[PDB]
């Protein structure tokens, strides 16, 4: 369900596996453009194993189709992030996500 | 407990019966708490006796009496003034305390809950001139206004009072929504909570829904905030059901409160060109320009940089083009007078577009775009890239 | 834009009463919201609007309320929590601090040097949302506290600069919005554990040269600056009782050995005598304390020292170091200048103020209050248990936030896991003076109080609640000796709600009555002093208990008897462990039990006591009879007939326990006799032996909820201590009809024992 | 074990004067209001602000000890007498006489460390005949008309303390089965002696000298509507303690024996009733035939025939 928007190549040569851990940055937000998260604020890269089922599928499914330092734009339906119940305070059931996804380092 | 006092003959020899004069306050209270009980059943029974049925109009309707009374009672809880003596204040404290007192322990606050449920059955002033008169009708507000302040004056301070009567908070909240008394219910909660944390422990989902719905429907309001703090904390001590209730129901959607976010200054930059086209003298209706960078940073602080290219109009003939009015997150294509590119998505009126393009990305380094621009037939065209 | 709302009031005002509420919905501990929230505006527009000079005052103010709660109140509070229990490891680094710079014309600087305290550690978590299931969000989301601290001492600096000047355009505003929020941010960040030694350094040449102590502040300025010297004063405090734990190591190395020293000298050197005797029950009889006690004790001419001389002298050395250290004859300096110069300038409003300023005055001027308020909750365990006590202080510390919230499902489960962990916890065992130091007795019985208030006999909700705090007291007055007489003082008022958690066979442990129980039991100095401002209390809730029944049992089907087994049972339990004790009854607490129950004749059943029922034998065996009728039950439910005999046969045992005794006192004291009288005469000996011989099967098991075998135990000591074993003829009758049909059923055993 | 016996008997001993220099660095208007003053004035609106129970208020109970100690041939006599009202006067005009009788009325009768403190600082304030404290202190008592206090004095005067036999046996039973510490307080026999001591001492230095009005004020409070008669309260209290006395000494028949405990609780008890008596026989110095006729239609016949009758034995 969720779809990638290339932003700027990344040399698509590198690519996620199994059994790996990738370091991103990205700056999520809601579909009306409500910026809800982001990675650049703390100053700090997210950090997140592959198939380890730690983040949602909606992010994890669009940064195994990525590249080393790939930009994309994750696009990604309701029923793959949070579903009818959405986040309790912050995402709205029945809600849309994008995410501005950058591979940093791939390990 | 109670015995029975029966007059007899013989007796018991344990009587022993001393007197006790009552203060000048207390007789003063029970007297005027004599005169309004009264006064309120006489209003009571007026009332009833037209909002039961369509019954011959001989009936007392004390309007302005209830009024004058209501005035006067309203006044007699007036909490002491704080450009006042410190002694002086806490005697007018104590004295209305023991008012107060006096007047919960006969049960009025029920009589004036009765009295605005009685008044209640109606919808406006027009709604009720008609049936009991125009006078009436004209003040049905008024007495509504002024039975909602005294009821807040009698649990203003005391911490019994609002423990006591905290059983009827769900006709209060339901209520809520009349539009013609919201303020002096919402005065009358939030007395309420303030006070007693007894009062916080009925408060249901239902409750801060219709809280929350009234936020929504009567505006901007900053004492519905003031409510939903009082609701979150009582006495140094949380409620964590009301806090994540209030969290949940209040802000996951966003179109309420006032939303915030942090952006970029972005300025443009344009040459001392001018393009008019009309009959008569015309300039071949037919423009070209190239473009290209030499150093850019997707992110610079925290956000992605703003970088677009394109042409804007102007108002009639004249220069300030219309658009985001100064020193703000606006370039070109944020608004109708103004058409821009950057690289992935056409801007126009700030909404961005999304096109297709040979290795379509961002406007990184060394990047030449050139923009056409063809007047009449055809519209403003950019190649990026050749 | 931001700054355009200073124009707009409406919005202006609207935005600051979001603010206070976006604060109010995290103010405590809880970081399921404060997640939420940290999105909700963002990561640095607090940073740039804490930073930002054209502020509307009021925003400025209520984000820096929001930064202060979000991230740094939670911990900034359960840091504070623990400010006044000074608990120290002896490790190698703790014993060099024993020098205290005091000499040499210096006196060092306030939170400069060591600390080797126990303190919880701080953890926040990163705020995430694209992570599914996050672990637990206990702590707190992370925030950047290197930046922070930077930009508050740059800013201070700024506002100190400006404020020297007196110019008319402050941030935000006046002045108390440039500067309260400000010096609030520097105190939490102060209070959090942050600014080590040179940033303190800093810290302190802000205000120290001899300033902002000399400016013209505003009175909620100058409130917060209270606080600030208040922790000034807290952190030299830390650093005394530091250095006296620090010296006091080397002297009983130095005293411990020389004491075993001498005792081995004048255990070599014997010379057998009168006095060698007297002078050696010193090491078997007087306990550590006194024996402590009494060695040490040098202040006026001569005492009865031992031997080491040599550590006197130090001692006293150390003693002259503590109060030159101490105000007695620069901190104190400054600060009593201070604070009766504000005062000399102007007269002051918001008595809080006043108030905070008269306490640092009296508290610079006495100076050695701290100490002998601190030292009582000093204590120090060793260098290898650490993360072991580092947890249960965690722990007590989440009961403590526990307790400063209601309390709800979520709440019960948080302090139920909290007290298992307690409980767990080895030092609970090893160190039983910690916990008294500590408080946590009291910590659990304030907030059992907050489970069994709202109500008296209408709700007993949350009953798990009550149970674990319950369980929890009993266990730590049992591993005692003076916790019992710690719960012995709280044992007056659980005693007025003890009616709680009875009549329902699911805590027969955990109960109010049963952990005054367990503080009264085995103790004759506590027997003694309970004296009787509850003995009545106890005696009337008997007298109702036997009077009504017990509207949750007719409610749940039970027959309706005409008075309740259950209540009236715990009762006589409660009374039988406060008048027998050691195997010998306090005659005074007997004595008064007898007379208050001979007063309120309800107290005892009906079936026995009254105008109607004869006595025990038929009312043991009507018990008996109802037992084998199910129809007089509730159609694991309470036995009825079985109820009725275990309340009969606890009231006997009481009166049983409550004779005077084996005739030590009675054969020539006049009240004992009396007493005695009074009871032969309650309880005939017919009845008695009559309920003894019954005989009851020897059962393929049974149930075992009926006539129990140790009902016969208690008519069996009522016989032995009130009328006793004298008389031959009567001897061999009673082992003829109460005891042979017993010992046959027990021995008639080969491989079925059921029942031991 | 050694920092307990260390904080126990080592730091609390004693160690510091500083009473009277802080005061006197306190009262200087350096430049209104002098910060004593001040403070004053805080601890009279924290006793008049209406409240349902007196709090612990560790300031004011460490403050007014403070304010209390600060206070204490020819020449070297004469001297000494000047200074000590000098001293008082420092304090007494800023307030004090009024805030320790709002203090004992905001108490309405509850023995505590607030009303134990704030007798001490009355002790302080009127040591000696100070007729202009005791003037203050009537004409703001007749200028606000209050029970409260008057109320407060008797409920405080109902409970003060009396000596029962059966805790001091029982404790000596204690005692004789192990060696239980001994208990601060008296041995829990006799509970607050020296706050009875105190309070007692109080009334006395409240009609120290002739003064006939408050004498009178003591026993009919005229101007007000609900007078309570503190000599007849008083009279109760020296029977109650009488019949204390009695009891104890018919516990000590037969036995030719005092022990330590028998002595230190009997001279407790004597103490306090010499302090009863010289209360009463400073109610009825001045010829105040009010007080006169009060004491002889009363109780005290039945406490000093008592007395008589356990003098006549011990002896």
């Known amino acids: 369900g969720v779809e990638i928007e290339t932003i700027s190549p990344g040399d698509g040569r590198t690519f996620p596996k199994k059994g790996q851990t990738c370091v991103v940055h990205y700056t999520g937000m809601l579909q009306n453009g409500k910026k809800f998260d982001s990675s650049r604020d703390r100053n700090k890269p997210f950090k997140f194993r592959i198939g380890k089922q730690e983040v949602i599928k909606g992010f994890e499914e669009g940064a195994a189709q990525m590249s080393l330092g790939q930009r994309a734009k994750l696009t990604c339906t309701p029923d793959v992030a949070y579903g009818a119940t959405g986040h309790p305070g912050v995402i709205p059931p029945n809600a849309t996500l994008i995410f501005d996804v950058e591979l940093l380092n791939l390990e | 407990i109670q015995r029975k006092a029966i007059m007899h003959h013989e007796g018991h020899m344990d009587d022993g019966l001393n007197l006790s004069r009552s203060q000048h306050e207390e007789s003063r209270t029970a007297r005027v708490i004599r005169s309004t009980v009264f006064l309120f059943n006489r209003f009571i029974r007026g009332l009833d006796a037209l909002s039961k049925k369509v ?47 006096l007047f919960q322990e006969e049960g009025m606050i029920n009589l004036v809950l009765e009295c605005i449920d009685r008044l209640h059955v109606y919808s406006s002033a027009a709604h009720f001139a008609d049936v009991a008169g125009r006078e009436a009708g004209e003040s049905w507000k008024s007495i509504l206004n002024s039975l909602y302040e005294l009821l807040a004056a009698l649990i203003r301070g005391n911490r019994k009072n609002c423990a006591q009567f905290s059983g009827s908070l769900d006709w209060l909240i339901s209520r809520l929504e009349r539009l013609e008394a919201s303020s002096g219910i919402l005065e009358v909660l939030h007395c309420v909570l303030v006070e007693s944390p007894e009062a916080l422990n009925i408060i249901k989902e239902g409750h801060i829904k219709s809280i929350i719905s009234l936020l929504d429907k009567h505006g901007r309001n900053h004492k519905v905030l003031d409510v939903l703090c009082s609701l979150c904390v009582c006495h140094g001590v949380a409620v964590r059901s ?20 942090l952006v970029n200054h972005v300025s443009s930059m344009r040459p001392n060109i001018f393009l008019g086209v009309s009959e008569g003298s015309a300039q071949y209706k037919k423009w070209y320009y190239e473009l290209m960078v030499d150093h850019t940073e997707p992110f610079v602080t925290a956000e992605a940089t703003h970088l677009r290219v394109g042409w804007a109009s102007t108002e009639g003939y004249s220069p300030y083009p219309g658009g985001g009015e100064e020193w703000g997150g606006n370039g070109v294509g944020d608004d109708l007078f103004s058409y821009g590119f950057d690289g992935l998505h056409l801007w126009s009126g700030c909404i961005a577009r999304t096109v297709s393009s040979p290795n379509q990305h961002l406007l990184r380094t060394d990047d030449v775009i050139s923009c056409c621009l063809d007047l009449s037939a055809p519209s403003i065209s950019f190649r990026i890239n050749g | 834009d931001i700054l355009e709302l200073t124009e707009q009031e409406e919005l202006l005002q609207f935005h600051y009463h979001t603010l206070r509420l976006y604060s109010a919905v995290c103010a405590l501990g809880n970081h399921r919201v404060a997640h939420a929230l940290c999105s909700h505006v963002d990561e640095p527009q607090l940073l740039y609007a804490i930073e930002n000079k054209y502020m509307p005052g009021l ?69 995430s949302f694209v992570s599914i299931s996050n672990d637990c969000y206990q702590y707190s989301p992370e925030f950047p506290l290197d930046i922070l601290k930077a930009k508050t001492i740059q800013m201070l600096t700024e506002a100190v600069k400006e404020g020297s ?337 009875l009549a329902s066979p699911a805590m027969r442990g955990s109960t109010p009555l049963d952990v005054a129980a367990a503080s009264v039991m085995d103790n004759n100095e506590l027997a003694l002093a309970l004296r009787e401002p509850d003995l009545e209390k106890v005696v009337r809730y008997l007298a109702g208990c036997g009077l009504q029944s017990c509207q949750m049992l007719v409610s749940k089907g039970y027959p309706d008897i005409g008075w309740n087994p259950v209540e009236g049972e715990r009762y006589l339990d409660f009374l039988r462990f406060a008048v027998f004790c050691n195997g010998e009854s306090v005659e005074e607490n007997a004595n008064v039990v007898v007379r208050l129950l001979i007063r309120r004749p309800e107290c005892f059943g009906p079936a026995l006591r009254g105008e109607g029922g004869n006595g025990l034998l038929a009312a043991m065996e009507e018990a008996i009879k109802i037992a084998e009728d199910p129809s007089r039950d509730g159609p694991d439910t309470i036995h009825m007939g079985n109820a009725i005999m275990t309340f009969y046969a606890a009231l006997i045992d009481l009166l049983g326990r409550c004779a005077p005794e084996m005739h030590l006192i009675h054969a020539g004291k006049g009240e004992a006799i009396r007493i005695r009288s009074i009871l032969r005469s309650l309880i005939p000996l017919g009845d008695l032996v009559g309920v003894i011989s019954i005989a009851f099967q020897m059962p393929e098991p049974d149930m075992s909820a009926g006539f129990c075998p140790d009902h016969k135990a208690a008519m069996v000591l009522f016989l032995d201590r009130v009328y006793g074993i004298e008389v031959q003829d009567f001897l061999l009758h009673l082992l003829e009809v109460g005891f042979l049909p017993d010992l046959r059923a027990a021995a008639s055993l080969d491989t079925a024992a059921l029942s031991x | 074990l050694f920092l307990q016996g260390y904080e126990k008997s080592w730091i609390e001993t004693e160690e510091h004067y500083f009473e009277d220099k802080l005061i006197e660095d306190l009262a200087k208007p350096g430049a209104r209001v002098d910060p004593l003053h001040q403070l004053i004035l805080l601890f009279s609106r924290t006793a008049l602000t209406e409240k349902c129970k007196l709090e612990e208020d560790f300031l004011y109970m460490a403050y007014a000890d403070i304010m209390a100690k600060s206070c204490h041939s020819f020449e070297e006599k004469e001297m000494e007498k000047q200074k000590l009202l000098y001293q008082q006067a420092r304090l007494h005009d800023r307030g004090a006489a009024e805030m320790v009788l709002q203090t004992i009325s905001a108490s309405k009768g509850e023995t505590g460390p607030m009303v134990a403190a704030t007798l001490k600082l009355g002790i302080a304030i009127l040591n000696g005949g100070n007729s202009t404290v005791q003037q203050k202190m009537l ?25 029962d036999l059966n805790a001091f046996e029982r404790q000596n039973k204690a005692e004789g089965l192990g060696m239980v510490t001994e208990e601060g307080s008296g041995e829990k026999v006799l509970q607050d002696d020296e706050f009875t001591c105190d309070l007692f001492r109080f009334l006395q230095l409240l009609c120290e000298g002739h003064n006939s009005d408050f004498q009178n004020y003591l026993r009919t409070q005229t101007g007000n509507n609900t007078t309570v008669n503190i000599i007849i309260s008083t009279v109760d209290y020296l029977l109650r303690v009488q019949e204390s006395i009695s009891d104890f000494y018919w516990y000590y028949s037969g036995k030719d024996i005092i022990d330590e405990q028998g002595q230190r609780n009997f001279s407790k008890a004597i103490q306090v009733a010499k302090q009863v008596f010289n209360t009463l026989t400073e109610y009825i110095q001045g010829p105040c035939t009010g007080n006169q006729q009060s004491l002889a239609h009363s109780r005290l016949w039945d406490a000093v025939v008592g007395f008589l009758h356990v003098f006549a034995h011990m002896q």
């Open chain 2, 55 to 101: 019954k011959l109009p001989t009936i007392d309707l004390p309007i302005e009496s209830v009024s004058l009374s209501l005035q006067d009672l309203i006044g007699y809880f007036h909490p002491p003034d704080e450009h006042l003596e410190h002694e002086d204040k806490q005697n007018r404290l104590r004295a209305l305390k023991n008012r107060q007192n």
């Open chain 3, 165 to 501: 000047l007196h110019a008319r355009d402050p941030v935000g505003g006046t002045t108390e919005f440039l500067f309260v929020p400000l010096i609030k941010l520097f105190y939490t960040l102060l209070i959090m554990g942050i600014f080590h030694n040179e940033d303190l350094k800093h810290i302190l040449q802000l205000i120290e040269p001899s300033g902002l102590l000399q400016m013209k502040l505003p009175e909620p300025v100058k409130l917060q600056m209270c606080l600030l010297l208040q922790y000034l004063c807290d952190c030299q405090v830390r650093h005394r009782i530091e250095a006296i734990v620090a010296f006091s190591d080397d002297f009983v190395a130095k005293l411990q050995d020389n004491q075993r020293f001498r005792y081995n000298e004048v255990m070599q050197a014997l010379n057998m005598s009168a006095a060698l005797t007297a002078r050696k029950t010193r090491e078997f009889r007087s306990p550590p304390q006194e024996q402590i006690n009494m060695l040490l004790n040098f202040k006026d001419d001569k005492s009865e020292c031992p031997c080491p001389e040599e550590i006197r002298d130090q001692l006293l050395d150390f003693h002259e170091d503590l109060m030159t250290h101490c105000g007695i004859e620069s901190l104190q300096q400054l600060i009593s200048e201070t604070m009766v110069r504000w005062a000399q300038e102007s007269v002051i409003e918001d008595p809080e103020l006043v108030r905070a300023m008269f306490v640092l005055l009296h508290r610079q001027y006495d100076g050695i209050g701290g100490l002998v308020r601190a030292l009582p909750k000093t204590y120090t365990i060793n260098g290898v248990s650490v993360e072991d006590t580092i947890n249960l202080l965690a722990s007590l510390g989440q009961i403590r936030s526990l307790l400063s919230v209601r309390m709800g499902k979520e709440e019960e489960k948080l302090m139920i896991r909290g007290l298992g962990d307690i409980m767990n916890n080895k030092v609970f065992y090893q160190h039983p003076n910690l916990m008294r130091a500590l408080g946590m007795h009291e910590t659990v019985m304030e907030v059992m109080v907050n489970v069994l208030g709202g109500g008296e006999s209408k709700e007993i909700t949350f009953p798990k609640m009550v149970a674990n705090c319950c369980r929890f007291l009993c266990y730590f007055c049992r591993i005692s000796r003076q916790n019992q007489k710690a719960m012995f003082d709280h044992l007056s008022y659980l005693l007025e709600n003890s009616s709680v958690g």
């Open chain 3, 59 to 127: 925003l400025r103010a209520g984000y820096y309320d929001l930064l202060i709660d979000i991230h740094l109140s939670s911990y900034a509070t359960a840091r504070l929590m623990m400010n006044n229990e000074f608990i120290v490891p002896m490790t190698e680094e703790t014993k060099s601090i024993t020098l205290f710079p005091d000499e040499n014309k210096k006196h060092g600087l306030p939170g400069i040097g060591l600390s080797t305290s126990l303190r919880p550690r701080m953890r926040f978590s990163s705020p």
């Open chain 4, 139 to 163: 004409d703001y008592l007749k200028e606000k008309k209050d029970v409260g206090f008057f109320q407060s004095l008797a409920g405080l005067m109902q409970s003060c303390s009396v000596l």
């Open chain 2, 242 to 261: 009301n806090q994540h209730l209030i969290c949940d129901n209040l802000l996951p959607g966003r179109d309420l409160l006032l939303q915030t976010r």
